[PDB]
A paper describes a structure:
We recently identified and characterized a fused toxin–antitoxin system called CapRelSJ46 that protects Escherichia coli against diverse phages. CapRelSJ46 contains an N-terminal toxin domain and a C-terminal antitoxin domain that normally binds and autoinhibits the N-terminal toxin. Activated CapRelSJ46 then pyrophosphorylates the 3′ end of transfer RNAs, which inhibits protein translation and restricts phage propagation. Here we discovered an additional protein trigger for CapRelSJ46 in the phage [name]. This alternative trigger, Gp54Bas11, is a small protein of 66 amino acids with unknown function.
Next, we determined the structure of a CapRelSJ46–Gp54Bas11 complex to 2.2 Å resolution. This complex had ATP bound in the pyrophosphate donor site, stacked between R79 and R116, similar to that of other RelA/SpoT homologue enzymes, which indicated that the complex captures the active state of the enzyme. In the complex, the hydrophobic core of the Gp54Bas11 β-barrel binds to both the amphipathic anchor-1 and pseudo-ZFD of CapRelSJ46. The interface is further stabilized by a polar network between D273, N275, K278 and S279 from CapRelSJ46 and Q47 and N50 from Gp54Bas11. Whereas Gp54Bas11 β2–β5 bind on one side of the pseudo-ZFD of CapRelSJ46 interacting with β7 and anchor-1, the long β1–β2 loop of Gp54Bas11 folds into β-strand β1′ and binds on the other side, making contacts with β8 of the pseudo-ZFD and effectively clamping the pseudo-ZFD. In addition, binding by β1′ of Gp54Bas11 to CapRelSJ46 β8 moves the pseudo-ZFD further from the active site compared with the unbound open state of CapRelSJ46, which probably primes the enzyme to bind and modify target tRNAs.
Residue numbers in the entry:
A (entry chain B): 15 to 57
B (entry chain A): 13 to 92, 103 to 296, 304 to 372
The structure:
């Protein structure tokens, strides 16, 4: 019954949680899980 | 438990004219019985299709999917003039092939098969439909002429044949249509820009695939329109963000953090750190939807936030189930769009 999605902001991004890598802004970012619901992307 | 085909056609007429109460509950019970009759032939056609796909591709790369059409979907279709006993797809199978040469090779094998299941209609959609949809549908009648005491006689099962790029287009159309709440199938009115985007990208998919070759002047004008529509709709960004948010909600640690009966929203946000970025996925109960929307507008107003999206968990769940390889498809479709826009 609720709206399936509300889009406010976004960019072209890809993430692979097996390789723990992310791709955005023409750069490669290393992924690390800080909490169950939180991640950091570092150079 | 034992309803005749006359009782089932009469039950379907009742739902069309808008029955209620005990009358509606009997009509739906007979239609559910008819729906269950398609299960054995659906699975039989699925193995028939898997056996024929393993013959055409010795690498075993053809992906085969199947689905029994939901009772609620059938009921909705009747009360919106398709006849229930004329419906070709209560059971539906699908083969996803590498290219058009593989597609035609699989069609020829299914057409030359000498079984009790007859192709009553071959639908050639290699030239895209007004929606932009392209591929091939085979309408089978299982146990068509050889029957006797067979309860599965003349059972209709649909077989869809598609290439990976035709499938990537269809997956992206379902993701946008679901998550953006644009009822493209429901109505033939509204969202002319999204309708035109999917039609032109569909035409360019069938050109690239070799399914339907367009002349050079048409390619040039379609690419110009595609660049225009894509900028207006922010297709590559919406498609990437939705896929990224869906990927994160499949994380194992995230799923234990969830309330056990989660059925609300997920708020996915990416922000700059004090080059470093923080990505969070915030679960919300269905009752806290107003709180979720308030938190979404705060992130939309923040200049440090690059991604801010709100997604209902039930919709994420059904798209992941319908499309196991949704991320391979949205990636391929986004790359295809970049090749035609940046020409
Ligand atoms: N032949 C098929 N084989 C496998 N999956 C299918 C087939 N037909 C539909 N599906 C998929 O099943 C899901 C449920 O779709 P649904 O039954 O509600 O509508 P539909 O069959 O695609 O279209 P329509 O209602 O217009 O006839 C969708 O993801 C759809 O792509
Ligand atoms: Mg269908
Ligand atoms: Na898929």
């Amino acid at each position: 019954e609720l709206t399936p999605g509300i889009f406010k902001k976004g960019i072209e991004i890809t993430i692979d949680l097996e390789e723990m890598v992310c791709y955005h802004s023409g750069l490669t970012w290393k992924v690390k899980q800080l909490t169950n619901t939180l991640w950091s992307l570092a150079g | 438990l034992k309803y005749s085909k006359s009782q089932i056609e009469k039950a379907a007429r009742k739902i069309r004219h808008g029955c209620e109460g005990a009358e509606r509950e009997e009509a739906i019970k007979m239609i559910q019985n008819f729906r269950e009759l398609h299960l054995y032939p659906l699975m039989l056609m699925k193995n028939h299709l898997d056996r024929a796909a393993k013959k055409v591709d010795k690498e075993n790369k053809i992906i085969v999917a199947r689905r029994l059409k939901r009772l609620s979907t059938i009921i909705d279709k009747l009360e919106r003039a398709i006849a229930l006993t004329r419906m070709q797809d209560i059971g539906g199978c699908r083969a996803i092939v590498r290219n058009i040469e593989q597609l035609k090779k699989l069609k020829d094998r299914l057409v030359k098969s000498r079984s009790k299941h007859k192709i009553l209609k071959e639908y050639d959609y290699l030239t895209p439909k007004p929606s932009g949809y392209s591929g091939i549908h085979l309408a089978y009648s299982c146990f068509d002429e050889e029957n006797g005491n067979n309860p599965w006689s003349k059972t209709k099962i649909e077989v869809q044949l598609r290439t990976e790029l035709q499938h990537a287009w269809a997956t992206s159309l379902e993701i946008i249509d679901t998550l953006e709440n644009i009822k493209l199938k429901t109505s033939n009115e509204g969202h002319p820009e999204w309708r035109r985007f999917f039609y032109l990208s569909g035409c360019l998919v069938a050109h690239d695939e070799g399914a339907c070759i367009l002349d050079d002047e048409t390619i040039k004008n379609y690419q110009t329109e595609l660049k225009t529509l894509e900028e207006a709709l922010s297709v590559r960004s919406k498609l990437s963000t939705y896929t990224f948010a869906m990927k994160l909600t499949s994380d194992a640690n995230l799923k234990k953090s969830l309330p056990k009966n989660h059925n609300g929203f997920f708020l996915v946000r990416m922000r700059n750190a004090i080059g470093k970025f923080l990505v969070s996925v915030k679960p919300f109960r269905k009752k806290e939807s107003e709180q979720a929307l308030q938190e979404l507008n705060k992130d939309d107003a923040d200049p440090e936030v690059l991604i801010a999206v709100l997604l209902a968990t039930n919709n994420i769940k059904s798209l992941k189930k319908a499309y196991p390889n949704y991320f391979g498809s949205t990636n391929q479709f986004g790359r295809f769009l970049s090749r035609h826009i940046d020409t």
